[PDB]
Design a protein around this ligand. Structure first.
Ligand SMILES: *[C@@H]1O[C@H](CO)[C@@H](O[C@@H]2O[C@H](CO)[C@@H](O[C@@H]3O[C@H](CO)[C@@H](O)[C@H](O[C@H]4O[C@H](CO)[C@@H](O)[C@H](O)[C@@H]4O)[C@@H]3O)[C@H](O)[C@H]2NC(C)=O)[C@H](O)[C@H]1NC(C)=O
Ligand SMILES: *[C@@H]1O[C@H](CO)[C@@H](O[C@@H]2O[C@H](CO)[C@@H](O[C@@H]3O[C@H](CO)[C@@H](O)[C@H](O)[C@@H]3O)[C@H](O)[C@H]2NC(C)=O)[C@H](O)[C@H]1NC(C)=O
Ligand SMILES: *[C@@H]1O[C@H](CO)[C@@H](O[C@@H]2O[C@H](CO)[C@@H](O[C@@H]3O[C@H](CO)[C@@H](O)[C@H](O)[C@@H]3O)[C@H](O)[C@H]2NC(C)=O)[C@H](O)[C@H]1NC(C)=O
Ligand SMILES: *[C@@H]1O[C@H](CO)[C@@H](O[C@@H]2O[C@H](CO)[C@@H](O)[C@H](O)[C@H]2NC(C)=O)[C@H](O)[C@H]1NC(C)=O
Ligand SMILES: *[C@@H]1O[C@H](CO)[C@@H](O[C@@H]2O[C@H](CO)[C@@H](O)[C@H](O)[C@H]2NC(C)=O)[C@H](O)[C@H]1NC(C)=O
Ligand SMILES: *[C@@H]1O[C@H](CO)[C@@H](O[C@@H]2O[C@H](CO)[C@@H](O)[C@H](O)[C@H]2NC(C)=O)[C@H](O)[C@H]1NC(C)=O
Ligand SMILES: *[C@@H]1O[C@H](CO)[C@@H](O[C@@H]2O[C@H](CO)[C@@H](O)[C@H](O)[C@H]2NC(C)=O)[C@H](O)[C@H]1NC(C)=O
Ligand SMILES: *[C@@H]1O[C@H](CO)[C@@H](O[C@@H]2O[C@H](CO)[C@@H](O)[C@H](O)[C@H]2NC(C)=O)[C@H](O)[C@H]1NC(C)=O
Ligand SMILES: *[C@@H]1O[C@H](CO)[C@@H](O[C@@H]2O[C@H](CO)[C@@H](O)[C@H](O)[C@H]2NC(C)=O)[C@H](O)[C@H]1NC(C)=O
Ligand SMILES: *[C@@H]1O[C@H](CO)[C@@H](O[C@@H]2O[C@H](CO)[C@@H](O)[C@H](O)[C@H]2NC(C)=O)[C@H](O)[C@H]1NC(C)=O
Ligand SMILES: *[C@@H]1O[C@H](CO)[C@@H](O[C@@H]2O[C@H](CO)[C@@H](O)[C@H](O)[C@H]2NC(C)=O)[C@H](O)[C@H]1NC(C)=O
Ligand SMILES: *[C@@H]1O[C@H](CO)[C@@H](O[C@@H]2O[C@H](CO)[C@@H](O)[C@H](O)[C@H]2NC(C)=O)[C@H](O)[C@H]1NC(C)=O
Ligand SMILES: *[C@@H]1O[C@H](CO)[C@@H](O[C@@H]2O[C@H](CO)[C@@H](O)[C@H](O)[C@H]2NC(C)=O)[C@H](O)[C@H]1NC(C)=O
Ligand SMILES: *[C@@H]1O[C@H](CO)[C@@H](O)[C@H](O)[C@H]1NC(C)=O
Ligand SMILES: *[C@@H]1O[C@H](CO)[C@@H](O)[C@H](O)[C@H]1NC(C)=O
Ligand SMILES: *[C@@H]1O[C@H](CO)[C@@H](O)[C@H](O)[C@H]1NC(C)=O
Ligand SMILES: *[C@@H]1O[C@H](CO)[C@@H](O)[C@H](O)[C@H]1NC(C)=O
Ligand SMILES: *[C@@H]1O[C@H](CO)[C@@H](O)[C@H](O)[C@H]1NC(C)=O
Ligand SMILES: *[C@@H]1O[C@H](CO)[C@@H](O)[C@H](O)[C@H]1NC(C)=O
Ligand SMILES: *[C@@H]1O[C@H](CO)[C@@H](O)[C@H](O)[C@H]1NC(C)=O
Ligand SMILES: *[C@@H]1O[C@H](CO)[C@@H](O)[C@H](O)[C@H]1NC(C)=O
Ligand SMILES: *[C@@H]1O[C@H](CO)[C@@H](O)[C@H](O)[C@H]1NC(C)=O
Ligand SMILES: *[C@@H]1O[C@H](CO)[C@@H](O)[C@H](O)[C@H]1NC(C)=O
Ligand SMILES: *[C@@H]1O[C@H](CO)[C@@H](O)[C@H](O)[C@H]1NC(C)=O
Ligand SMILES: *[C@@H]1O[C@H](CO)[C@@H](O)[C@H](O)[C@H]1NC(C)=O
Lengths: 449, 147, 147, 147, 52
């Protein structure tokens, strides 16, 4: 048939693409609100009306294990902290000798230590004795006795500004013009292959950036059942992402009361430290209910057995070593940094057939090094008053041991230190596409000479 | 009916050719969500550098969206049909490019799977478009003027 | 006669329709006073940061002037008349939109007070312009080709 | 034959008028060598400032290439011929502007030395182009509508 | 024994010697798409219509 090309512009076709998205946070007046590191000078106020245009007949292939949104969220998070902490004061004078001692007179199991050191007055030629109350994790020994901080060898401990506030605030990742984001709505999506229900979205829902290990706090829930999700299930070195359909609540506190000193450093730059224990010394702890935790493990075992076998025995162990960042459960709540001992949750067997809460003891330290960069460290100023937190547990990160024996007993352990498992468990249903408007098609049109 | 942006992605070539103005205005004028980059009145110092490091990453996606748009609008001016969202270019459809017959294309194929078959030949289909227009503009029109 | 930019702001709709090329070229090519942003040869350090903080504020007004210009030029391509500073769109003037009769409009009204009366109905006048062009481009022209 | 960019700089006005699409697409879409400005994944701090000081100097040449392009494309819309790489404007060639006769121009002169002779009169040749189009658009077309 | 007026709170930044602070006329200009309108009425108290 004798036909002639016609040219169409605006035709709805796609190619897969890679690009850099928009931070796009939510916004208010914030006239008295303290500058907040997660947003401010990075984000723009959010389209208040996302439109989820449901497509017909479209079947697209997604892959959550090769996504770039997870790979640039981990790069922005380092760049959001590293750009806020340029103006902040360095704590270089505090690398001195400390005349410290115990706080109590009768040791039961101590925690705090009471120190003494010199510090400059206003005029920088006069020296005075000042004290503070440092935790014992943040103090090491030189040789009555004389102590010093944990990192005077290599690191410059940058005091986090007091006008700052670190806090989960929902970031919406948006695409600029010429790009689009596609959302899966299939409820059985294990993470790869075709998604038979696709809808274009302007901007994703608001994920709350929380940096935790071994357990996923304030996450997004499943839809019908528990969703077990991993890459190459028979491979040991791959983590196993678990996602709940119902939240499991937690209650955390620091039950001792504290105030702040105001030991100055220089003209206009002070330093905060722990001053007094107004009350009684108590250990920080967290509660998980037991009847809800024993039923939430009744579902994770149930759908592990569809991947391994019905007649197998499924057991949970606790850990096998490492630093505090990967043997325990890390938080960021209320301005302090809790590292709770979770050897009481992950301890049971399963054999294929009211109000009593599980208490979790918990440590505190205030000189943290996040991402383990060489010669860098942070410092969290103390919070005046006791701290209270309430959170949900929506998900786990297990890992499988698997040596070469013949036994029918699998053992699953919680896993820690890689932040890309926190983000890959949230942006799994997305893909960015490119919009190519020109197209050609044969017809009977003939320009008319 | 307008279903919104990309709503006709699963429809036929016949039924999705009703919606061509949607993917054109949202190819540029979806930037109205980016003109918020003139931000609120900033405070004093302490992160004055963070204000401009994140200012370039907002502006590379503004400029890159503009200067990828003009080179696809200009290319329609080379073929002889600028402005029109539908033009006809008077180049014979060689039957080695594709297949069946005219009528199983517009009734039960989508543009996405159509684009797959003809993507292999797109640089030679774009080759004849700039040749059947050059023969008309410099030869025919200056001859039909004086004759 | 050309009185300069906006000189016909107080004239009639009849007498100010002579000057339409003035507010078009000074809507973009008044940027010739901004191309001085390629500054003189700067000295050494000590305010190297001030050179780029004030560099973005100069460039947001360059980019924002460009990408507000294209979306109002493209919209004339949707209606069927691109390029022309005067086009005619073949949509009947509904007599509920406005008033008197054709002749007290062009002789003793200005465009500013005319824009006030018809601003309330501008999104429905722009609604019929993209419909009397779509009926012509996809229906009429492909039928008058084959017939 | 296409010799590449500016290849017809030494040819005649007759033989170099075959190659007009080359200096048009390489006037804008030679920017494809600049879209590499979305660089590789940068490392940590220590020269985070050098990344944005050299970021503006890359982007002034992107924006300046765009907004010098549009004002020369718009000017063809003032004269009445937008889109076309060859248009004809119906303004009589005054014989005080230039010289010999029609036929020693297209056969043994280049565009460079032709541009020298007519550069002295270019602002008055551009003056009549916007006047023989205004007389057609506002006077003739609205009279040939109603009559 | 004396001291400066602000050793408590402030960091007194010495203004560079290569600097010069001095009134120099700044002209406020509008970019493209914007314009500035000037009143020329000689009785303009600051509000209401300006007939010129
Ligand atoms: C998981 O999500 C939960 C639910 O949102 C979240 O709990 C929230 O924690 C924040 C911690 O900042 C709470 O905010 C505080 O709430 C108390 C309630 O009395 C207020 O007093 C606080 O106000 C102070 O805020 C600053 C603290 O110094 C001061 O600058 C200020 O002047 C006030 O003194 C503050 O608003 C928030 O209320 C809860 N949400 C609910 C619903 O209770 C939890 O933190 C998340 N988990 C993790 C690990 O982040
Ligand atoms: C997540 O879900 C996807 C799809 O629901 C699973 O992909 C499926 O993987 C199995 C692996 O055995 C594929 O079966 C094999 O197919 C090949 C031919 O393709 C055949 O040679 C083999 O004998 C076997 O039948 C199956 O095709 C594939 N599904 C699709 C639609 O292609 C994936 O395994 C799931 N992930 C996990 C961890 O379970
Ligand atoms: C600066 O000049 C302006 C205008 O020249 C002054 O505005 C005038 O203010 C008076 C206030 O009494 C207005 O008079 C009132 O009018 C209302 C109706 O609008 C009427 O109800 C009152 O009884 C009274 O007559 C007057 O209308 C207004 N001028 C115009 C043109 O509207 C303004 O007061 C001057 N400022 C100062 C500080 O003097
Ligand atoms: C998916 O595309 C089909 C086109 O094949 C749409 O239209 C249906 O087409 C079949 C076969 O031509 C008919 O039997 C159906 O009656 C058509 N649907 C309707 C509603 O008339 C179909 O509509 C598209 N899918 C959806 C969910 O709209
Ligand atoms: C302060 O408390 C610490 C923590 O218990 C005491 O540390 C002891 O240090 C000695 C020194 O070698 C060790 O042998 C002990 O094992 C440590 N623990 C205990 C429980 O004795 C320390 O003794 C306390 N300070 C003083 C002055 O007694
Ligand atoms: C930590 O040690 C300091 C001194 O090293 C204690 O401060 C002293 O408290 C007594 C109260 O009986 C006062 O009489 C002294 O004047 C204080 N000394 C100074 C220098 O202020 C402080 O009480 C200790 N803190 C704890 C929790 O034991
Ligand atoms: C700084 O580093 C030195 C070297 O590691 C620490 O001193 C001890 O040095 C001996 C021999 O080099 C090691 O065997 C010990 O393990 C070191 N002790 C510790 C606690 O690491 C010194 O303590 C370090 N100082 C700080 C503040 O960390
Ligand atoms: C923690 O300690 C502070 C004091 O440092 C307590 O605040 C006092 O509360 C009482 C009772 O309301 C008031 O009379 C005092 O005026 C408060 N003092 C200050 C300085 O504000 C606070 O209540 C304690 N928190 C808890 C949970 O016991
Ligand atoms: C965590 O703390 C909350 C309180 O903030 C507890 O909620 C209360 O639970 C008791 C017992 O069921 C009820 O009588 C109260 O009415 C609840 N408070 C509210 C505000 O509803 C919750 O039980 C705690 N969770 C765990 C696991 O201990
Ligand atoms: C849970 O983990 C802890 C440490 O993380 C293990 O504790 C050790 O238990 C053995 C007894 O088999 C003791 O000899 C060690 O001293 C303990 N370690 C420490 C650091 O105290 C424990 O075995 C794990 N399992 C259970 C069921 O508690
Ligand atoms: C985490 O908690 C468990 C218990 O919940 C700790 O195990 C105890 O370890 C000490 C050290 O010898 C023993 O005296 C206790 O008998 C152990 N408890 C039980 C129930 O066996 C474990 O050590 C804690 N983790 C760390 C790192 O200390
Ligand atoms: C943490 O979990 C609780 C329990 O789901 C959430 O609180 C609400 O609980 C009611 C139960 O009566 C549900 O119907 C609501 O859907 C829950 N959400 C809201 C927003 O009301 C609580 O919101 C969870 N925390 C976060 C941060 O989402
Ligand atoms: C720094 O501040 C102190 C506190 O105001 C000044 O010392 C005097 O302190 C007493 C009691 O606090 C006040 O009643 C006096 O009014 C203060 N004197 C003055 C002059 O303010 C101290 O002088 C201040 N130093 C400087 C350099 O301003
Ligand atoms: C949880 O419940 C199951 C079933 O009732 C029971 O076998 C088991 O002992 C309980 N406790 C734990 C720690 O698994
Ligand atoms: C395991 O149990 C499931 C439950 O329905 C069943 O479908 C499957 O056949 C069982 N497999 C074996 C090997 O018994
Ligand atoms: C671990 O499990 C054993 C056996 O059920 C139990 O006795 C022990 O208390 C558990 N450990 C902790 C820390 O609760
Ligand atoms: C059609 O295409 C083939 C290969 O692309 C080419 O050899 C042939 O000359 C073309 N034209 C015809 C058959 O008219
Ligand atoms: C078009 O081709 C198909 C298969 O090649 C044939 O079945 C059909 O009859 C042809 N003619 C039409 C649709 O008019
Ligand atoms: C596309 O081109 C490649 C290379 O010649 C060829 O192998 C393939 O069959 C072509 N596919 C189609 C659909 O023409
Ligand atoms: C004119 O406008 C009114 C209201 O805007 C509308 O109801 C009517 O259908 C329009 N058309 C006519 C009267 O032809
Ligand atoms: C137009 O309308 C006005 C008032 O409605 C009337 O005075 C005039 O005669 C009308 N006709 C014209 C101007 O031809
Ligand atoms: C403009 O619209 C509002 C809302 O309907 C109406 O009250 C007002 O009278 C309208 N004005 C004109 C001039 O049509
Ligand atoms: C030709 O140009 C001269 C000077 O540029 C001018 O005086 C004359 O009016 C022009 N027109 C003619 C001779 O038609
Ligand atoms: C054009 O002018 C030149 C010199 O003025 C003359 O030699 C020639 O004969 C003229 N006519 C032509 C080329 O037809
Ligand atoms: C160009 O203009 C200048 C100024 O009038 C004049 O001196 C010169 O001769 C002109 N050159 C040409 C080639 O017309």
């Amino acid at each position: 048939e004798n036909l002639w090309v016609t040219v169409y512009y605006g035709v709805p076709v796609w190619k897969d693409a890679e690009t850099t998205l928009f931070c796009a946070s939510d916004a208010k007046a914030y006239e008295t609100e303290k500058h907040n590191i997660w947003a401010t000078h990075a984000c723009v106020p959010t389209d208040p009306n996302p439109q989820e245009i449901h497509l017909e007949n479209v079947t697209e292939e997604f892959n959550m294990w090769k996504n770039n949104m997870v790979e640039q969220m981990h790069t922005d998070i380092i760049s959001l902290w590293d750009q806020s902490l340029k103006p902040c004061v360095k704590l270089t004078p505090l690398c001195v000798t400390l005349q410290c001692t115990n706080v109590t007179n009768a040791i039961t199991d101590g925690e705090l230590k009471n120190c003494s050191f010199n510090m400059t007055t206003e005029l920088r030629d006069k020296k005075q004795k000042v004290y503070s109350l440092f935790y014992r994790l943040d103090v090491v020994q030189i040789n009555n006795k004389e102590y010093r901080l944990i990192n005077c060898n290599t690191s410059a401990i940058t005091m986090v500004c007091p006008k700052l506030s670190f806090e989960p605030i929902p970031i919406h990742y948006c695409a600029p013009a010429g790009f689009a984001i596609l959302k899966c709505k299939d409820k059985k999506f294990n993470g790869t292959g075709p998604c038979p229900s696709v809808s274009t979205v302007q901007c994703t829902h608001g994920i709350k950036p929380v940096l935790s290990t071994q357990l996923l706090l304030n996450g997004s829930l499943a839809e019908e059942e528990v969703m077990i999700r991993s890459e190459n299930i028979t491979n040991n070195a791959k983590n196993i992402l678990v996602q709940f359909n119902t939240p499991v609540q937690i209650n955390c506190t620091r039950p001792l009361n504290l105030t702040r000193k105001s030991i100055r450093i220089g003209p206009g730059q002070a330093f905060y430290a722990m001053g007094d224990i107004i009350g009684d010394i108590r250990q920080a702890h967290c509660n998980v209910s037991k009847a809800t935790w024993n039923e939430t493990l009744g579902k994770v075992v149930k759908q592990l057995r569809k991947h391994f076998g019905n007649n197998t025995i499924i057991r949970f162990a606790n850990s096998s070593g490492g630093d505090l960042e990967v043997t325990t459960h890390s938080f960021n709540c209320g301005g302090e940094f809790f590292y709770c001992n979770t050897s009481g949750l992950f301890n049971s067997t399963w054999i294929s057939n009211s109000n009593d809460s599980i208490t979790l003891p918990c440590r505190i330290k205030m000189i943290i090094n996040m991402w383990q960069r060489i010669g860098q460290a942070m410092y969290a100023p103390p919070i005046q008053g006791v701290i209270r937190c309430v959170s949900n547990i929506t998900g786990l990160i297990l890992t499988r041991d698997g040596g070469s024996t013949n036994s029918t007993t699998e053992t699953f352990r919680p896993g820690g230190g890689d932040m890309r498992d926190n983000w890959r468990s949230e942006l799994y249903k997305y893909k960015v596409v490119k919009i190519e408007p020109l197209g050609v098609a044969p017809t009977r049109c003939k320009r008319r000479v | 009916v307008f279903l919104g942006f990309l709503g006709a992605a699963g429809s036929t070539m016949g039924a999705a050719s009703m919606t061509l103005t949607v993917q054109a205005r949202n190819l540029l004028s979806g930037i109205v969500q980016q003109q918020s980059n003139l931000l609120r009145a900033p405070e004093a110092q302490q992160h004055l550098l963070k204000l401009t490091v994140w200012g370039i990453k907002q502006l590379q996606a503004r400029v890159l969206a503009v200067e990828r748009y003009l080179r696809d609008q200009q290319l329609l001016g080379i073929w002889g049909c600028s402005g029109k969202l539908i033009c006809c270019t008077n180049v014979p459809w060689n039957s080695s490019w594709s297949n069946r017959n005219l009528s199983e294309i517009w009734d039960n194929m989508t543009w996405l799977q159509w684009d797959k078959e003809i993507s292999n030949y797109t640089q030679i289909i774009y080759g004849l478009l700039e040749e059947s227009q050059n023969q008309q503009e410099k030869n025919e029109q200056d001859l039909l003027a004086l004759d």
